[PDB]
Amino acid sequence: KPEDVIKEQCARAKVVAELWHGFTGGAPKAALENLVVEFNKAQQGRCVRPVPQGGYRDLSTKIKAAFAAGKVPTMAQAFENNIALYLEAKALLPIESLGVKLQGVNLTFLNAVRFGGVVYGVPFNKSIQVLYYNKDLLKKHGVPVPATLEEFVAAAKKLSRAEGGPVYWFQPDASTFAYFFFNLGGSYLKDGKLVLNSKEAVEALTLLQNGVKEGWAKPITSGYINQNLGSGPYAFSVDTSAGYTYYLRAAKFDLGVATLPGRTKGQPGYGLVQGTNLVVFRQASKEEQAVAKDFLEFVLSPRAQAVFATATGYVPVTEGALKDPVYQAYAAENPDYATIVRQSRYAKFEPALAEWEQIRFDILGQAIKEAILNKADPKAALDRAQKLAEDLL
Ligand SMILES: Nc1nc2c(ncn2[C@@H]2O[C@H](COP(=O)(O)O[C@H]3[C@@H](O)[C@H](n4ccc(=O)[nH]c4=O)O[C@@H]3CO)[C@H]3CC(O)(O)C[C@H]32)c(=O)[nH]1
Ligand SMILES: O=S([O-])[O-]
Ligand SMILES: [Cl-]
Numbered sequence: 001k002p003e004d005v006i007k008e009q010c011a012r013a014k015v016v017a018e019l020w021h022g023f024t025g026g027a028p029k030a031a032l033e034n035l036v037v038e039f040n041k042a043q044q045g046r047c048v049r050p051v052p053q054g055g056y057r058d059l060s061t062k063i064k065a066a067f068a069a070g071k072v073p074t075m076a077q078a079f080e081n082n083i084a085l086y087l088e089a090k091a092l093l094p095i096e097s098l099g100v101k102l103q104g105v106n107l108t109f110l111n112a113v114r115f116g117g118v119v120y121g122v123p124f125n126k127s128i129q130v131l132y133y134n135k136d137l138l139k140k141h142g143v144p145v146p147a148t149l150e151e152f153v154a155a156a157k158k159l160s161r162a163e164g165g166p167v168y169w170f171q172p173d174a175s176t177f178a179y180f181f182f183n184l185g186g187s188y189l190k191d192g193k194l195v196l197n198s199k200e201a202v203e204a205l206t207l208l209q210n211g212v213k214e215g216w217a218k219p220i221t222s223g224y225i226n227q228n229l230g231s232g233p234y235a236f237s238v239d240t241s242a243g244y245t246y247y248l249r250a251a252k253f254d255l256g257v258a259t260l261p262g263r264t265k266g267q268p269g270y271g272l273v274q275g276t277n278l279v280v281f282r283q284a285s286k287e288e289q290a291v292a293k294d295f296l297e298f299v300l301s302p303r304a305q306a307v308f309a310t311a312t313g314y315v316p317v318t319e320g321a322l323k324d325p326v327y328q329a330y331a332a333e334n335p336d337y338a339t340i341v342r343q344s345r346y347a348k349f350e351p352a353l354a355e356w357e358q359i360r361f362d363i364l365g366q367a368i369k370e371a372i373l374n375k376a377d378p379k380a381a382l383d384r385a386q387k388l389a390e391d392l393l
Contacts, residue, residue, distance in 0.1 A: 002030065002033035002036075003033055003050075005033075005037050006036055006037060006048075007049075009047050010047040010049045012045070013040075013043075013046060015045070015047070015285075015287045015288060016049045017046075017048050017049070017073075017074035017288045017291035018048075018051050019050045019051065019073065019075040019076065019077075019278070020051050020062060020073045020075070020076040021050055021053065021059065021076070021276075022052075022056035022057075022059040022276070023052065024052065024055060026245060026246055028125065028314075029052070030311070031308050031311035031312050032125075033050060035298075035299065035304055035308055036048050036050050039294075042298075047291070048074075048075075048291065056077070056079070056276070057357070057361065059076065060082055060357055063076055063082070067089060067091065070283075071283075072283045072284070073281065073284075074284040074289070074292050075278050075281070075295070076278070076279055076281070077125070077276035077277070078277050078278070079274075079276055079356075080112045080121075080277070080349060080350075080352040081351070081352050081356035083115065083277065084115065084353060085357075087115055090282065091281055091282055091283070092120045092121075092281065092282065093282050093284075093289065095119045095120060095122055095280065096119055098280065098292065098296070100122065100296045100297060100300070101297075101300075102119060102300075104318050104320050105300065106315075106317055106318065106344075108273070108344065108345075108347045109123035109273075112273070112352070113277050115352075120279060121278065122277055122278045122279075122299065122300065123277050124275075124276060124277060124317070125275040125276055125308070125312070126273055126275045126276075126314060126315050126317055127240040127273065127314055128240075128241050128272070128343050128344045128347055129175070129179055129238050129240060129241070129260060129271035129274075130238075130239070130240075130241050130259070130339065130340060130343050131146075131236060131238060131259065131260055131261065132225075132239055132247055132256070133235060133236050133256040133257075133258060134167075134235050134236075134251075134253045134255075135253070136253045136254050137159060137233060137235050137253065138155075138159070138235065138256070143155050143158060143159055145258045146236075146261045147265045148261050148262060148265060149183055149184075149261050149262070149269070151261060152261040153207075153211075155235070155236070156168040156211070156217065156236060157214065160215055160216040160235075163233035165218070165232045166211075166216050166217055166218035167216065167218070168216055168217045168235065168236045168237070169217075169234055169237045170208065170217060170218070170225070170237060170238065171219075171220050171225065172208070172219050172220075172221070172369050173365050174361070174364045174365045174368065175272055177204055177205060177208070177364070178272040179260065179269065179270075179271065179272060180204035180205075180207055181200055181201055182269070182270040182348045183260070183261075183262060183263060183269040184200045184263075185200050185263075186203075187200070188350065188351050194351060194359070196385040197379065197382035197383050197385065202382060205367075205371050205381065206378045208368075208371075212372060218232070219372050219373060224246065225237045225239055225247075226239075226243055226247045226250040226251075227246075229251055229252070230252055234253075238260065238271075241257075241340045241343070242275055242312055242313050243313065244312065244313025244336065245312060245313060257339045258339065259342055259343045259346075268343060268346045270346050270347065271347060273344075273347045273349050275314055278299065280296075302318060302320035302321050302324040303326060305318050305320070305324070306321050306324035306326040306327035306330075307326060309337070313336075315341065315344040353393070355392050355393060358392065359389050363388045363392070364389075367381040367384060367385035368381075370384075
């Protein structure tokens with residue numbers, strides 16, 4: 001068990017840098033621990049201790065408690081909005097002040113960790129949405145993988161009619177809504193104001209709610225989409241690439257990965273970038289900061305990124321990772337890794353506002369759930385979301 005190995009490594013160590021994370025298990029937790037085990041073996045008496053804090057929401061709550069208690073870890077995973085929050089307290093070390101080189105990091109990811117021109121995060125486990133699909137079920141009914149939103153809706157209705165059940169499965173949540181919202185031309189910031197109830201928002205939430213009414217979209221209310229597989233016909237989901245190993249272990253059918261359907265065939269749709277960056281807390285000792293420096297250099301190395309990305313379905317964050325022989329050997333055997341990289345070229349972020357975590361779950365996610373599960377009118381549900389968000393900001 002890698003967490004037992006690390007516990008023993010850290011027991012023999014003169015300096016331990018704690019890294020608080022939101023991996024509850026599967027391949028992401030095993031890949032993070034395996035990376036830490038190798039880092040720790042290369043050091044002389046210096047270690048990283050990964051500390052599971054629950055999911056990402058539990059992690060952000062535990063960091064809030066840590067600020068209140070006046071005792072932060074050395075490193076933590078952080079979404080771009082969590083970075084914005086922690087910078088209000090000036091709790092974060094600039095990454096380049098540690099002497100970590102970021103050249104060769106993808107500008108999609110590096111730009112998202114740059115605040116006021118300075119980098120306060122190291123992109124580590126960055127995901128993109130992809131189209132997961134049931135190759136067997138599409139083959140059975142001769143339905144090509146849809147390249148456009150129009151094709152996707154047609155494919156879902158045709159397969160749902162043939163199978164007697166809704167085949168597009170989705171979580172009624174902010175992540176899923178972002179795919180439809182972005183690819184209907186939606187934009188969350190209008191002259192720097194956060195807008196949740198634009199016509200593209202209403203259109204995105206109407207399309208999902210109509211999908212449920214018309215019997216081609218199946219809301220998943222309990223667990224992850226990959227935990228629900230096997231109950232009723234499944235053709236498609238739009239989901240994080242970090243879901244890849246979880247789909248593979250659950251799927252009784254031949255799992256497919258495609259680029260996202262876009263407005264036209266001239267370009268794939270935009271996917272939502274999720275997963276986290278590593279931040280380094282100012283409060284850490286110079287000795288713990290020096291361990292963070294080396295760990296970050298290690299996490300950005302082409303081998304570390306190649307192994308982590310091939311073990312998980314996360315997007316390798318560097319140019320050098322794609323040139324690493326381990327990455328190349330996996331990609332040559334499994335086209336899904338190249339599909340994830342291609343889709344990572346067409347990448348949108350949610351707003352990096354300090355309040356965004358509360359807004360995306362408690363306000364926006366609640367409005368999506370009202371409309372999908374309680375048949376609330378999409379505009380009325382999003383107008384309420386807008387009022388609650390305007391009150392919070
Ligand atoms: N706190 C906070 N969370 C945020 C923010 N923006 C987006 N997200 C959440 O990031 C999750 C995606 O990040 P990612 O690392 O791509 O995927 C996660 C897991 O989602 C995924 N997983 C785990 C178990 C499983 O059976 N299936 C599976 O796919 O594996 C990875 C590690 O757990 C989304 C999903 C959500 O958690 O419901 C809400 C979303 C934010 O601003 N703050
Ligand atoms: O972001 S570039 O790959 O179009
Ligand atoms: Cl959580």
